[PDB]
């Protein structure tokens, strides 16, 4: 399991949590020096538990699929919640079995479905460590509209930060003040599968992507990523979705 406490949290303790989260995901291989997540894992071992504590010390446990960093569901006191999707239903076979009741949220874990439930795109939802404290608190008691927004915050501040060092840094900058995500942040989230695929296809193509990946940069400018020498590959991306899962 990995853990993160909002009480006393600072850029450093958050950085230690995102490092723990990355290090909890198993890999047998690196591709271009980036850990390659596994094609699959059997049974309970497929799921990492993240224990998150709001500023007051209340906690949820979030179940994450270690092959793709997808949040499947979470436990809040004696109630479990899972996304309305087959992979989460399968997860519910393995985690939080001791919950007194299981609620299936009325959406899947897809960014578009979450944004429609929440009533807003994530361009307009501030993220940061204060927003994560709020998200944890919201998820403590069921409210499906409020929870969609909380889950947009939670997914970006945990999974997306584990995946991209830039997103981790964006959150550290927002340790004491929320702010909506930069265009670059949104771009990276949206390209993770694409990037993962192109970095693995590069392995037999002299480091060159079969198909260029288009991103937005730090100044809000649209750039083409064509090969493994790009800073996005050498510095930013920390985990690769296995092409078997693409």
Ligand X SMILES: *[C@@H]1O[C@H](CO)[C@@H](O)[C@H](O)[C@H]1NC(C)=O
Which residues sit in the known binding site for UTP? 69, 71, 111, 160, 163
Residue 81 in the binding site for ligand M7G (CB under 6 A): no
Binding residue count for ligand X, defined by CB under 6 A:
5
- Cβ-based burial of 100 (10 A; exposed 0-12, middle 13-18, buried ≥19): exposed
Q: Is 206 helix (H, G, I), strand (E, B) or coil?
A: coil
Contacting ligand M7G within 129-148 (CB under 6 A): none
Q: Which of 183, 227, 243, 245 binds ligand X (CB under 6 A)?
A: 227
CA 150 to each of CA 13, 98, 131, 216: distance values in angstroms, whole numbers, following the listed order = 21, 24, 8, 25
226's contact among ligand M7G, ligand X, none, with CB below 5 to 8 A by partner kind, is ligand X
DSSP state of 155: H
Name the helix (H) or strand (E) containing 172.
Answer: helix 165-173
- 71 vs 136, which CB is nearer to ligand M7G? 71
Residue 110 in the binding site for ligand M7G (CB under 6 A): yes
Residue 7 in the binding site for ligand M7G (CB under 6 A): no
The Cβ-side half-sphere exposure at 99, using a 13 Å CA radius, reads 22
- 130 vs 181, which CB is nearer to ligand M7G? 181
137's contact among ligand X, ligand M7G, none, with CB below 5 to 8 A by partner kind, is none
Distance CA 78, CA 204 (A): 49
Annotated catalytic residue 29: no
Residue 159 in the binding site for ligand M7G (CB under 6 A): yes
């Amino acid at each position: 399991d990995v853990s993160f406490r909002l009480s006393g949290a600072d850029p450093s303790s958050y950085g230690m949590f995102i490092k723990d989260l990355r290090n909890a995901l198993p890999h047998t291989e690196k591709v271009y020096n980036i850990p390659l997540l596994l094609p699959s894992v059997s049974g309970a071992g497929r799921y990492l538990l993240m224990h998150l504590f709001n500023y007051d010390g209340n906690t949820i446990t979030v179940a994450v699929d270690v092959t793709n960093v997808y949040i499947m569901g979470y436990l809040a006191l004696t109630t479990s919640y899972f996304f309305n999707e087959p992979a989460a239903d399968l997860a519910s076979q393995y985690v939080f079995r001791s919950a007194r009741r299981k609620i299936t949220l009325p959406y899947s874990g897809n960014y578009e479905r979450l944004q429609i439930a929440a009533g807003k795109p994530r361009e307009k939802i501030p993220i940061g460590l204060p927003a994560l404290d709020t998200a944890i608190s919201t998820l403590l008691h069921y409210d499906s509209t409020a929870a969609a927004g909380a889950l947009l915050v939670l997914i970006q501040t945990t999974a997306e930060a584990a995946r991209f060092k830039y997103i981790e840094q964006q959150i550290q900058e927002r340790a004491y003040r929320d702010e909506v995500p930069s265009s670059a942040t949104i771009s990276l989230e949206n390209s993770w599968s694409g990037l993962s695929k192109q970095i693995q296809l590069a392995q037999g193509n002299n480091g060159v992507f079969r198909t260029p990946t288009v991103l937005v940069d730090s100044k809000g400018n649209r750039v083409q990523i064509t090969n493994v020498t790009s800073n996005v590959v050498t510095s930013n991306i920390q985990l690769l979705l296995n092409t078997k899962n693409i």
